Design an enzyme around this catalytic site. Structure first.
Site, PDB file in Angstrom:
ATOM      1  N   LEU A 192       3.641  -2.903  43.144  1.00 43.15           N
ATOM      2  CA  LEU A 192       3.713  -4.170  43.186  1.00 43.15           C
ATOM      3  C   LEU A 192       3.582  -5.296  41.538  1.00 43.15           C
ATOM      4  O   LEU A 192       4.355  -4.139  40.751  1.00 43.15           O
ATOM      5  CB  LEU A 192       2.308  -4.964  43.957  1.00 43.15           C
ATOM      6  CG  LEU A 192       2.611  -4.750  45.424  1.00 43.15           C
ATOM      7  CD1 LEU A 192       1.308  -4.115  45.736  1.00 43.15           C
ATOM      8  CD2 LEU A 192       3.259  -6.012  46.478  1.00 43.15           C
ATOM      9  N   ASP A 193       3.516  -6.259  41.569  1.00 47.07           N
ATOM     10  CA  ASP A 193       3.662  -7.025  40.183  1.00 47.07           C
ATOM     11  C   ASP A 193       2.647  -7.523  40.477  1.00 47.07           C
ATOM     12  O   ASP A 193       1.418  -7.083  40.966  1.00 47.07           O
ATOM     13  CB  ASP A 193       4.722  -8.363  40.348  1.00 47.07           C
ATOM     14  CG  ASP A 193       5.371  -8.729  39.089  1.00 47.07           C
ATOM     15  OD1 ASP A 193       5.260  -7.641  38.031  1.00 47.07           O
ATOM     16  OD2 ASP A 193       6.023  -9.039  39.177  1.00 47.07           O
TER      17      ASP A 193
END
Lengths: 177, 87, 459, 70, 101, 128
Positions: free
Chosen positions: B41-42
């Site tokens: 993810l970020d």
């Protein structure tokens, strides 16, 4: 700015702090859940518009103008959690957080009605007074010249050794006395 | 009033909130999953997830502590040390 | 008054003949017995003074001050018997001897029939207070405070001596009854100007007047608890009693003379109170509160109206008891935390509940909470000064804010908030301290029921 | 259940001080108020009367309450 | 170098360790209990209670109550003979000689 | 556009609007590292003196004693009488006194003149 471990806030930390504060203020200004979700998606898209950047100066005054716009569009009365500072219930039960060392001043008449707990407290006090010497021996050698540079403390290294300066964190008072 | 909470319930509720996320899948989500390394993810997703648990449990986690809550077990650890579980 | 002097002169060998472990108990028992016998002076009249002989008399003004003095001495012996537990037996007996001699000096001074006897006894009160301050004080610079106190008193009181001897050589006597019956008006002349100044400046020094109050924020701090109590609760009222006696002899010049001096208080008690808003030392805050109360006393005595006199004596007694209690509280906290810094010890209510209750009661009695004696006195002073002029209500009313704005502030920082982490030697409350503070407080709340005995000579 | 020990300062000393203060106040307050109410009920107050011709009373006869007269 | 010889700072004396029921009076318990007994007897039981009894029963203080009784006579006189309630002159004007001018 | 924040004596500039916080120069980096090292050394000294089992008392804070002595006893040895201190003492020390004395003298003269000519309503004023 003012952090315990790091001496400065990097660009990533500033961006994430601005994003979190913007989301909090937007949730304050957009009371209903669906409007808040829609404008949070819009704000995430706006943040992802300038995510992939290669010039540091461009990111610098882009963050400057973004912070100016966030200051202009803030809620005058932002929502604050009850346990957060500035809240209605902040540090209330801190008035009832009596420290443990006062238990050393009790009368023997009122110490006789909790025998087992005071025996376990005596064992903990003995453990502290036998761990202090090796914890300060550990902290003496590990400290370099000029003292420690960061506020981070070294953990327990040898088996059977407690972490240095552990009493006033492990025996801190409970949240709900 | 004010019922006590147990650590099993804490991880059950945290995995419940995680498992409703649309940028995550309910198959390879585990309690020792790194969010960018083992899950992909970020950082924006990370701060937004931290804000999601801040709204879920009703108290504010500071950013200095929020940057390090990097796995669901670490989030459970922070909630556990904040709320004084296993009394 | 030979029924009280001889018991003190017999108390002197009583503390010079006891064992090393029985001085405190015997002195406390016998001083409390003398305090019990002290109530026989209340046989007063609304029109005559109780005269015993040619040298001693006591009207309804000096009687509450006498009762307060020989009630305060046993409290002094209780308050000063712990921090002197490490001292030598000879020095401990010398300390008790100085306290007993000071009580004898005060009870001889308050009943002086003639003014020259009052003056010589008034200057004779200097010696044991100076000895206590310069010997048993804690801080380094106590010598400067002792020198300042002694020199302010002497430089005030020597023109008082010259004026008193001049008055005696002029008219013929210095008896207060004779001067009440042989009074003469003083015209508006420069000789009478300097006569008024010489007769007043000693008492304005010992009150103290604003401008000449600089001997208080030092000598009230570095002195021990007994010296602080005898400086705060007796000697200022000694100067006030002297000014009350003297101002009969200086009419009608004062009606156009006391314009600066009154107003030298009427502004000063504002800004000195503001100093209590920005004080880091608790004992200095108590001393400046005493300065403000004595400035109110100065205004009340100098306007010479009856209601002002009643308010002056009531506020004198109430402020003496309250300041003694506050000094005892400061001494107890300083003994527990080994520092006079107010910002250091915080959150004492979570550790000391009974001491927090005593702090609350003392702070409430300091801000003139009705129906205590302090509210009665200050209210009578405000009525009298509003009779004097209108706009002066502002100069009192704003003080009504600022007093609260420090006193509850003194209640907050020392009691309310998160407690200090590194301070872990806060012992539970000693029975001696609780007994001393109850003996300070309960007479005030009991006299709140029947204040008619402490409202002055003309009630 | 799950009883937790409430950490508190030692409350023995202030309670002992208050108890002994109440005891030593009441140990003399009760007999003096019993004597006062027995003086009021049995001995009783005085009565106002005009001065007879040829009588010069003592000073304590010019007062009403027996404690005041004493 | 080293300064003049002096003892180190003596620590504060925690009285409750050597005596669990001490009261901040003296080391030995018996004289401490005697000090407690004498202060609570001759400070509360003897002077305060009997002092409240004494001040509650002063014999008609300052004759003030008597003055009210005298007033109870005087207006009773002056409401009987038709005299005015209170004269505006404290002394008799017939025994006053004003300075002639 | 936007309304730019104008700082005042009672309204400080926000920390995130400061240009000096947005400086990435090396000198600011060594200044931050040096102050972090100083703060870490002081914190280490405090929690070394704080967690000692043998110590039962007050941990001495030199900064507090320094502040109290600077506020209380070190104001007169470092005083020089110059024109600024003289002007501030003349404006604040005697100005309110003479102003109050003049206004009170005027008011009392007016009241005495009104009373002595028999115009002030003093009919029921018998308490003074």
């Amino acid at each position: 700015a003012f952090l315990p471990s790091a001496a400065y806030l990097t660009h990533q930390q500033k961006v994430l702090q601005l994003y979190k504060r913007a989301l909090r203020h937007l949730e304050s200004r957009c009371v209903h859940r669906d409007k808040y979700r829609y404008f949070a998606c819009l704000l995430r898209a706006r943040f992802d518009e300038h995510k992939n950047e290669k010039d540091m100066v461009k990111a610098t005054q882009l963050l400057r103008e973004a912070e100016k716009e966030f200051w202009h569009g803030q809620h005058p009365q932002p929502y604050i959690f009850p346990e957060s500072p500035g809240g209605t219930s902040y540090e209330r039960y801190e008035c009832y957080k009596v420290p443990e060392w006062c238990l050393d001043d009790w009368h023997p008449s009122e110490k006789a009605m909790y025998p087992d707990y005071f025996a376990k407290r005596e064992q903990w006090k003995k453990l502290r007074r036998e761990s202090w010497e090796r914890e300060v021996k550990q902290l003496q050698e590990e400290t370099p010249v000029g003292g420690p540079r960061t506020e981070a403390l070294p953990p327990a290294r040898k088996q059977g050794d407690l972490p240095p300066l552990w009493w006033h964190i492990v025996t801190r008072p409970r949240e709900r006395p | 009033d004010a019922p006590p909470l147990t650590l099993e319930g804490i991880k059950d509720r945290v995995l419940y909130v995680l498992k409703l996320y649309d940028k995550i899948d309910p198959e390879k989500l585990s309690v020792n999953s790194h969010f960018m390394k083992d899950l992909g993810l970020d950082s924006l997703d990370q701060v937004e997830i931290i804000m999601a648990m801040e709204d879920e449990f009703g108290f504010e986690i500071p950013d200095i502590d929020a940057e390090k809550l990097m796995c669901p077990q670490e989030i459970v650890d922070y909630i556990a040390d904040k709320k004084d579980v296993y009394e | 008054m030979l029924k009280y002097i001889i018991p003190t002169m017999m108390l002197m060998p009583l503390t010079w003949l006891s064992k090393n472990s029985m001085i405190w108990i015997n002195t406390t028992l016998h001083s409390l017995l003398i305090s019990l016998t002290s109530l026989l002076l209340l046989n007063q009249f609304g029109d005559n003074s109780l005269n015993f002989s040619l040298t001693f008399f006591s009207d309804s003004l000096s009687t509450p001050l006498l009762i307060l003095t020989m009630w305060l001495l046993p409290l002094m012996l209780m308050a000063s018997q712990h921090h002197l537990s490490k001292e030598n037996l000879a020095r401990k007996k010398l300390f008790i001897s100085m306290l007993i001699l000071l009580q004898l000096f005060l009870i001889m001074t308050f009943t002086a029939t003639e003014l020259i006897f009052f003056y010589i006894m008034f200057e004779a009160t200097l010696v044991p207070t100076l000895i206590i301050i310069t010997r048993w004080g804690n801080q380094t610079e106590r010598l400067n405070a002792g020198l300042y106190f002694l020199f302010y008193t002497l430089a005030g009181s020597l023109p008082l001596l010259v004026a008193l001897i001049y008055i005696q050589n002029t008219m013929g006597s210095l008896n207060f009854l004779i001067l009440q019956y042989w009074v003469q008006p003083m015209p508006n002349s420069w000789s009478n100007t300097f006569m008024w100044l010489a007769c007043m400046m000693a008492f304005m020094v010992k009150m103290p007047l604003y401008g000449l109050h600089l001997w208080l924020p030092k000598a009230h701090v570095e002195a021990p608890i007994a010296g602080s109590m005898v400086l705060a609760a007796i000697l200022l009222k000694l100067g006030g009693y002297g000014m009350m006696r003297i101002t009969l002899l200086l009419n009608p010049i004062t009606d156009f003379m006391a314009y600066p001096f009154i107003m030298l208080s009427l502004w000063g008690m504002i800004m000195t109170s503001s100093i209590c808003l920005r004080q880091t030392d608790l004992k200095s805050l108590i001393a400046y509160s005493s300065v403000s109360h004595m400035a109110l006393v100065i205004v009340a005595i100098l306007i010479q109206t009856p209601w002002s006199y009643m308010g002056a004596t009531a506020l004198m007694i109430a402020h003496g008891l309250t300041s003694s209690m506050l000094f005892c509280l400061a001494n107890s906290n300083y003994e527990r935390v080994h520092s006079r810094t107010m910002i250091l010890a915080r959150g004492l209510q979570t550790l000391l509940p009974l001491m927090a209750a005593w702090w609350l009661l003392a702070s409430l009695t300091n801000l003139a909470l009705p129906p205590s004696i302090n509210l009665i006195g200050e209210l009578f002073v405000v009525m009298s000064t509003f009779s004097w002029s209108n706009i002066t209500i502002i100069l009192m009313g704003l003080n009504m804010v600022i007093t609260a704005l420090y006193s509850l502030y003194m209640l907050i920082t020392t009691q309310r908030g998160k407690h200090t982490h590194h301070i872990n030697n806060i012992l539970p409350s000693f029975t001696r301290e609780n007994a001393l503070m109850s003996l300070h407080m309960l007479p005030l709340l009991l006299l709140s029921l029947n204040p008619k005995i402490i409202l002055g000579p003309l009630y | 259940g799950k009883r937790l020990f409430i950490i508190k300062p030692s409350g023995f000393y202030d309670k002992r001080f208050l108890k002994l203060l109440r005891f030593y106040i009441l140990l003399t307050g009760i007999p003096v108020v019993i004597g006062i109410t027995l003086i009021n009920v049995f001995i009783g107050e005085a009565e106002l009367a005009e001065i007879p011709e040829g009588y010069v009373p003592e000073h304590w006869e010019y007062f009403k309450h027996p404690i005041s007269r004493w | 170098t080293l300064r003049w010889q002096e003892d180190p700072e003596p620590e504060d004396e925690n009285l409750y360790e050597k005596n669990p029921d001490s009261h901040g009076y003296d080391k030995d318990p018996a004289v401490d209990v005697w000090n407690m007994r004498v202060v609570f007897f001759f400070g509360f039981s003897i002077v305060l209670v009997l002092g409240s009894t004494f001040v509650a029963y002063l014999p008609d203080y300052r004759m003030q109550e008597w003055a009210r009784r005298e007033a109870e006579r005087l207006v009773k006189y002056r409401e009987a003979h038709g005299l005015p309630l209170m004269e505006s002159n404290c002394f008799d004007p017939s025994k006053i000689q004003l300075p002639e001018d | 556009s936007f309304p730019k924040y104008e700082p005042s004596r009672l309204a400080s500039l926000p920390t995130t609007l400061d240009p000096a916080e947005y400086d990435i120069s090396s000198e600011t980096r060594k200044a931050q590292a040096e102050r972090l090292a100083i703060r870490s050394r002081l914190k280490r000294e405090y929690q070394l003196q704080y967690n000692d089992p043998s110590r039962r008392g007050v941990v001495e804070d030199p900064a507090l004693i320094r502040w109290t002595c600077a506020r209380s006893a070190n104001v007169y040895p470092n005083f020089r009488p110059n024109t600024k201190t003289s002007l501030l003492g003349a404006l604040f020390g005697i100005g309110p006194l003479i102003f109050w004395y003049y206004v009170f003298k005027t008011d009392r003269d007016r009241k005495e003149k009104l009373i002595q000519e028999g115009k002030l309503d003093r009919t029921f004023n018998i308490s003074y």
